[model samples]
Target: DGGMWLMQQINGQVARMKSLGMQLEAADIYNPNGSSLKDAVVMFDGGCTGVLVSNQGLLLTNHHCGYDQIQKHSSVQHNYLKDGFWSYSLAEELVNPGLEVEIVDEITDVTAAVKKELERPSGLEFLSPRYLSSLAPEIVASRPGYRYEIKAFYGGNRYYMFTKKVFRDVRLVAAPPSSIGKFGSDTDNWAWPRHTGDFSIFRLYADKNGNPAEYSKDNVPYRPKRWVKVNAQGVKEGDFALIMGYPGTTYKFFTADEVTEWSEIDNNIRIEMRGILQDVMLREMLADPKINIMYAAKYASSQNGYKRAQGANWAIRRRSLREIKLAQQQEVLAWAKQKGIATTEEAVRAISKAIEGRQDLRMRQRYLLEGILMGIEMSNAPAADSDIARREAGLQSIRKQFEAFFNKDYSPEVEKDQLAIALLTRYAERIPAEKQPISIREGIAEYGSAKAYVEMIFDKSIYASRERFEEFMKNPDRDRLLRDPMSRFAASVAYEHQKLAKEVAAFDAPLAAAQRSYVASVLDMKGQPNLAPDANLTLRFTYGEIKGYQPRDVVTYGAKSTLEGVMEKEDPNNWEYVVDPKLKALYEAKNYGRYANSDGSMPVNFCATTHTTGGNAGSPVMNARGELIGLNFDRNWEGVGGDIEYLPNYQRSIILDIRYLLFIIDKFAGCQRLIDEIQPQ
Candidate 1:
C-alpha cells in the first residue's frame, strides 16, 4: 500500500502479492535475461512513464503527458487539442521532434563500487555529483548505442546505474480533446471522484533493422520484446492492482528545518507567483479561442504546479509532516547516541545551522525564479538576432527557427500583459531594487510604471509580434534586432539570475554534507524494515488494492467511476465540463461494446491505494493477473502531502480505466484498426 519499491526488491512483496490474488512471480514483472513487464515500460519523453501495449510498439500514456506534442501539432485550422488527433494508418502517424522514449536496457547496483573509492564519514565528498558522474562514464564508455545515468537513493546512501536505449523516432497516434481528457480542468485537478479520460496514444519508431534512430520517413514501427495484455473485464471493489513507474522524488527522509525551508520558501513562492500568471492567462484564453489553443499546454503546465503547491502547503499546515520528520529524527538520534561515532547528532545540528544561514538567499532565488523566470513567457527568450544572424547564410534558416518558436506558441497579446505583470510583482516590488538586473531597475526609473515600460518594448521590439518580426526579417537589420528592448531585458534577467545562483551555492555545501551523514546514519540504525530512500526517477514498483476512501467525515466515494459520472459532471456552459456530441450519443445509446462492465455501464476512471507522485503521471495500473487495467493519471489533493508520507485512507491514485481508452477508439472515434491492433479477438 506504500513505498515506491525498487523492482529488484520484488521478491520481498511476492508472497504478500500472491495472498492478494496475483497469478505471476517476480520474474514475470522484472526478469533481466528474459522478456518481462519492465521490457514494455518506457521512460516517456524524459518526464513521464509510458507502456507498450501492441507488438508494433503502440504506447499508452496520459493526455497531459503528451499535451505539449499535441499542442505543437495544433493550430487554428487543425485544432488537435480542441477536436482531438487520431491516425488510422502508420503513414498518418505524426513525428515529434525532440520527443524520445527511453527503455531501460539494464539496471546494475553500483553502491559497492563507489564506496570503494570514498569510504566513511568524510563529509560532502561522499555525495559529490562530480565524483558519481565520473565513475559512470568509465563504465558506459565501452558500450555504444546505449545511454547510462547513475542515480542515487536515500539521498546519497545507495546508487544504481540504469542503461537505456533511447528511441528518438516517436510519433503521435491519438488523443482526446479537453472535453474528455481534461474534463474537470483546474477545478478538479487534485480532487477525487474524477471522470477525466486522461490518456493519449503514441507509437515508437525505429530503424528498419530494429535499432534506435532519429526521425525518418523510412523508419518502421518498433517491435518490442514484450507488450502488456489488456483485460477489458475491468475491476470491482477489493480487486488486486499494481503500479510501476519512475516517481520524480519523495521526502520520507528530511529534518524539520529542511521541511520548513522548502514549504515556506519554494512551495509558497510558487503558489503566489503562479496565481498571478494563471489569473491573467485564463482571462485571455477564455476571451479568444486562438489564445486558448495556443496557451493550452502552457496554461496546463503552470496550473499543475500551482494546484500541487497549494495542496502541499495545505497538508503541511493541517497534517504537519514537519512534526513527523522532527519526531523521527529525535528517536533515531537517541537510539544511535551510544554508538562509537557521534556524527548522527552532529549532522542534525549542522543541518539546522545551514538552513538558517541560507534562508534569505534561498528566498530571493526562489522568488526570482518563480516570478520572473517562470511567470513571464518571454522573459528568458533568446534574443531574436545573435552573432550568427550577421551571416547571410543564416538569415533564412535562423528566421524559420525563430518563426517556429514565436509564431507557433507565442501570442503577443498574452505575453505583453504577462511581461507587465512580471515586472511589477517580481522585479520592482518583491526583490530589492539594487539586486535586480540594471535594465530592470532602470526601466522602473525611466518610465512612469511597469505597464508603461512593457508598452514601449512591445511597440518597438520586433520580437514582441509576428508582423513586426516579419518586416524586420525582410530588411535583415542587425543593429535594429540586437538593440531591441526585449532582447536586453531577457539577457539582463538571465545574467543576474545566474549570478544569484552562484552566490547561493556557497551556503548550501554544509547542508549537503550534513544531509549525507544524516541519511547514511539513519539507514544504518533503521534498515530496510523501517526505511526506504526517496524516489530518484528509477524503475520502481508499488502494489495496492482497488479501493476508495472517505474524502470527508460523511462523504463516501466509490473505487470505480462510470461514464454516467461524466454525464453527471457535464456542463455545456463550461468548456472543461462540455461533453462531445458523439460521445453523448454513444452514452445515450449505451454503445460501450466489449469495453463495458458486466452491468453494461461504461467505466471512465477509478481509484487505487497505489503510492505515486509527479513523475508517475502516465504509469501503468495493472491487475493481479498481470493485465493492463488502467493508466495512473493523478492523485487527490489530500495525497499531495504523500510526497512526504502516504495516507492510506485519504490518499488514492486516480486511474483512467483501460476500457474507456478502448471505447473512445472503438466506438467514439471508430478507429477500428487501433481497436483491432490492441484487442483483436
Candidate 2:
C-alpha cells in the first residue's frame, strides 16, 4: 500500500519528513493582505498555528477534518454542527471520543542507506526489496512514542527528517454541517467558481504535568505554551503568503518520462475507474439508507481518489508544461554532456523505460479492485443456518453455503456472476464499444457474457437504470437482473482469457518492483532529489504567493470569490446543504460582522497559487505576515494536478474564508465554545 495515505508510516523511516503530529511550533500566520494577521499559534496537526488566544487550549482546523467527529459526538442531547460550539471556560469543553494528538520529534534519513544498493545493476528483481529492507535498523531506532514512515518524491529526491510527539486528549469544539461546511460536497469538491466555509474547532487538554495523556474528567483544557493571536482584519491578493505545516505530497522533480506516463496512461485509467465508481457509490448512498451507513467510509475513500486523479488527468493532457520541463531537462543534460557525464541522461531514461514497461500489468488493476467488493459482499450476507438446527430447514445452511463456495480457493476462476454483479453495482455501462478504439473494444468484448451473468445474479434487468436499483431486491428474478454493460466490457477484455489475464496479473508485481526500482535508480544517479513527499493525510507546508489567474484571454480569477457568487450557486432549500443560511442572510444584510474582505470581494472563495497536493487537509494557509485568515482545504479543478504542473491560469488552491467559518459558529449554530478559546492579544 505505497498509496499516498500510507505516507505517514513511510515517513517514519525517511529523515527529511517532519512530524508535526501534535507538537507546537513558534510560527506566525498572517493574512495575504497583512491587515488580518496572528502571531504565536499551535497547529492542530502539530505543525503550526497562532498562539492560544485564551488560557484554554483550543485548536482550529478545516471543517472537513473534524466533520465526522462532530457528527459522532452530537446526539439528541447536544447538536453542535448546526449551532457550532464555543466554550466560555475550560470545564465547558467537551472531550471528543477516541481522539488523540500527535507530534513528530524524532526523524531518520534513509536516503543514503537506501541508495547503498544502487551500486549494483538496476533491475526490478534486485533493487526494490533489498533497498527498502535496508531501513530496518533506522526504523527500529525511531521508537517509543512516535509513528514512522519513508517519504520520497519525483523518482528520488533529497531526503529530510521527520520528528513529532502525540497526545490523546483532543476533543471536538465546533463544526458546521455538511451543507454549510461541505457545501458542494462531491459536486463542488475540487472545483473553482466556489464558496465554502470549511472550518472546525477542537481542544487539546493534558495532565497537570503538560504531558500527553488519555482523556480524564479531571483533565483541564491545556494552557498551551503556544497559541495564535486573532487578526480581526482580513486579506487580499499579491500579499506575501507562507503555509507552515506538513504538505502531503509533490511531484515537482519528476523526470519528463515519468510525467509522460502519468499524464498519458495512468491518469486515463484513474479517470475512467473513478468516473464509474463515483456513479456507483453515489447511487448506493442515495438509494438505500442502510447501505449508506455501510458504504460511508468507502464512499469517502473513493471520493478522495477521484479528486486527486481527476486533477492529475486534467494536468497531464496539457503538454506545454511538459515542454518547459523537457527543455530544462535538455539543458541539464547538455551541461552534463560537456563534462562527459553522458551516463546521467541514460540512467534517467532507463528509469522511464522501466516505468513504461510495467504499465500493461497495472492497467488490469481494476480486477484486483473489484475483488475487494466481492469480499465485502460475501462477508455481509446473513450466515447460513447451522446444521445443528437439525431441522428440515429448506434454506442452505451457512456451513453448506461456505462449503459450496468460499471454502475452495477459486483463485484465477472467481465466480463470474459474483464479479459481474459487483461491477454492475459499482457503475453503469454507458460507454459503448463504438466509442472505444479497436484496442479498447477488445477489452470490452467480455461485456456480453459478464452482462448476462450479472443479470442472472440479480434476477432483474432494471439495474441498468439508476432509478431501478432501489427495487433491485424486490424484483421477481432479483438474481437474474443485475446486468452491467461496463462489467461485460471489462470481463470481455480480462476474465475471458483467464490464463492470459494471469500472465498480465503477474506483470503488476514486477511492475510494482519497477516503480520502486525506478524511483531508487533516479535517486542513485542524481546525487539527491529535491521534491517533497506525497500527502499521507498529515499536516504539511506548501509555500506560494497570492496571485490572479488568466484563463484564456478575457477571464481572470483573482485570489477571491465573492459571497454573492457563492450565494447564487446555493439552492435555498439546499442552502444549508451548501451554504449556511445564517451566513447567507448576513451577507444579504451586509453583516460583514467585523470582518473586512481585503480583496474588496464578498470573500466566499479565495485562491493562492500555492503549490500543494492531496493529503494537505487542515493545512494552515498563512500570509506573508504569518496570520491564519484562510485554511488550505481544496484546489479548483484547474488546480487538481498542480502536483504535476502549475497553470497560472486555471490552477489555484481554494480556501474557505475565515470569517465565514466564524459566522457559521456565532450566528447560525449559536454555540460559541470555540469563540472564547482564542485570547487574541
Candidate 3:
C-alpha cells in the first residue's frame, strides 16, 4: 500500500492497480513512444518534485520546496512570507539564478551493460560499482546538454539510464503567505486533516527558440509536451489515486544490524545536534523580525530534519522494526538453506559480523562527521594555495561565497551559539580521545569552555567579516589562516576525520559486499514479482486510494480538510495560523466561485494511502484518469518511519487539494492570469 513503484514497471503496477479498482492502461501512465502522464512530472530545484499545470509552463510544488528561493527574495519591507507574493503579469515574475527544473526525456534499461561491467571479478569486491567511467560517457556524448545518470535498482540486480532535460530559467509566479502556505507551520507539519495550503507556483522559461538557457530577457515561456489537467471534483473514500515524483531513498534492502546502527546512532546524533542548532536559530529569530526572515528557511530545514528523526526513532521502536528485520533475515536464511546456496548463507552471516565490528567505529565516525567534519563553519573555510596569486584568487572566491551566504541568511550571534552547543558539545562528549582533534583539546584548554572558544573564533577570524575577508584577500596572509582558531580547528578536524574514515573504509568493503549479496539473493527468491527497488531520488510512481486512517484507537482522520477547518484552527495570538484579512473576509462571505465543492465547502488538504518521502514533496497526486488532484507535500508523523520501514496502516501521504490552490489564486490572491493558464479537465 505504501511503496514508490518505478515508472518503468508499468505493467506490473497496472495489474496491481486494477485490483484496487484503477481503470487505466500501462501506456496511459508512462509511454516513451510519445507524451504521457510522466511528461507533466519534473524534479524541482534538484530536491523536490513539481508538475507542469499549464501550457505556458506554470508549475506547482510545495511552498516549503520553494522556500529557499522565496526566503532569498524576501526582506523586512516586502515581507513576502507574511503577505505572500503574486505577480499579475509575466514581466513581474521573479527570476531565480542557479535554480532549475528537470524533466525526464527518456528512461532506458541498461541492465545488460551494467551487469557486463559488474561481472568482472575485480569489481565484485568493491563497495560501490564503477560503471560511470565505462558506461556514462557514451550516453552523455549521445545527448549533449542532457543530464545523464545511471541508477541501480533492486540493489544492483537491475539498472536503468535516465536522460533529463534541464530548464535553467524558473521563476516564482505566485505564493500565499506563510499564514496559508505554511498554515500549521512546524506545529501542523506532517499532521493529518491539515488545512495548510503548502503550495507555490512557478513558471519555466526557455530561450527564444525553446531551448534551455540561463535567465535572460530573451527567454519565453517553455512549451511542454504535456501539462496536467487539474480535477477539482474532490475525492471519495476509495477513489483511485497515484503519486509520481522522485522519492529520495529508502532502506527496504537493509539488514537489521544496518537499521539499528542508523536509527539508534546516526539518527540520534542528527536529531540531537539539529535540535540544539534549531533552538539557537529559533530563539534568535523570535527576538528579531529581520533575523526571523533571514533564518526562516534555515530554521525550517533544520527543524524538519530534527522532528523527522525524532519521529523515525519513536516509530522504529513502536513498530518493532528491528524485530521485523530479524524475521525477514531468518526467512531469507531458510530459503538459502533450502536452495542449498552456501555462499548466500555465508554472505548473510558475514553481514552480521561486519556490522558488529563496525558498530563502535561507525558511532564514533558519525560523531566526528556530524560534530566537526560536517560543521557549517568548517565546511565554509576558504581554500588555500602556496602561490600568492592563486591564494588571492581563492580568498576572493571564498569572500564572495561568504558574502552571498551572509547576505542571504547568517547571524553571528546565532551561529556562535550553534557552534558551541551543536558542534562542540557533541565533539567534547561523544568523540574518542584518539579521534579528537588537537584543535579541540587546545581550544578548551585555552578558553575553558566551548562557548569561549567559539566566541574567540568568530571574533578574531576574518571569515566572519566581509570587509576584512576581502582586505585579507588583497594582502593574502597564509600564516593568519593557519593561525586562526577556526581555520586551525577545521584543519585538525579534517585530518582526524580522514584518519577515521580510512579505518571505516576498511570495514565498508566487506560490509558492502555482504549487503549487496543479501539484496541480490532476496530478489532471486519468491519470483520477485512487484518488488520495486528502494527509492534513490529517481523518478518513480506509487499507487493507492484516497482514504483516511486511524493512527490510534478511537481517532480517525477525515479524508479531507476544508476552509471551515482553517477558520476553526485559527488563533490570532499564534503566528502560525494567523489568517489574512482578505482570506477571512472571503471565507465569511462564502466566496469560492467554481473552485468550491457542490456541497458549498472548500477543500484545503486531504490524506491518501500513496507512499511518499522527503523528495516526494511537491509530487503530483493524480486521479485514475491521470488528472492532477493535489500536490503531495508531507507524510503523517505516524508514517515518518516509512523511510526505513513502510507501515501501510499508519503511513499516509498528505496532499493539498487542487481546488484550494485554484481558489487561492483565482479569488484570494486575485492572480486571475495564473488561474486562466490552467485548463481544468
| TM-score per candidate | 0.85, 0.69, 0.86
- State the lDDT of candidate 1 residue by residue for 263-354, as single tens digits: 99989988988888788888888788988777887888899888889888877888777888889888888878777769898999998889
Where model 1 places Cα greater than 4 Å from the true spot, the runs are 68-99, 117-134, 205-223, 281-297, 338-340, 377-429, 433-436, 439-492
Q: Could you tell me the lDDT of residue 309 within candidate 2? A: 73
Mark the regions of model 3 whose C-alpha exceeds 4 Å error after superposition: 68-83, 87-96, 118-141, 204-223, 278-297, 372-426, 443-484
lDDT of 2 at 361: 45
Best by TM-score: 3
For model 3, give the 10-residue run with minimal summed lDDT.
Answer: 121-130
Please say which candidate is ahead in TM-score: 1 or 2: 1
Say which candidate scores most in lDDT: 1
Preferred candidate (lDDT higher): 2 or 3: 3
Candidate 2, 302-377: lDDT as tens digits? 7767676766665666536577667656766666776666555665665566666655544444433433233223
Better of 1 and 3 by TM-score: 3
RMSD of each: 4.4, 9.3, 4.1
Rank list by lDDT: 1, 3, 2
**So what's the TM-score on candidate 1?**
0.85
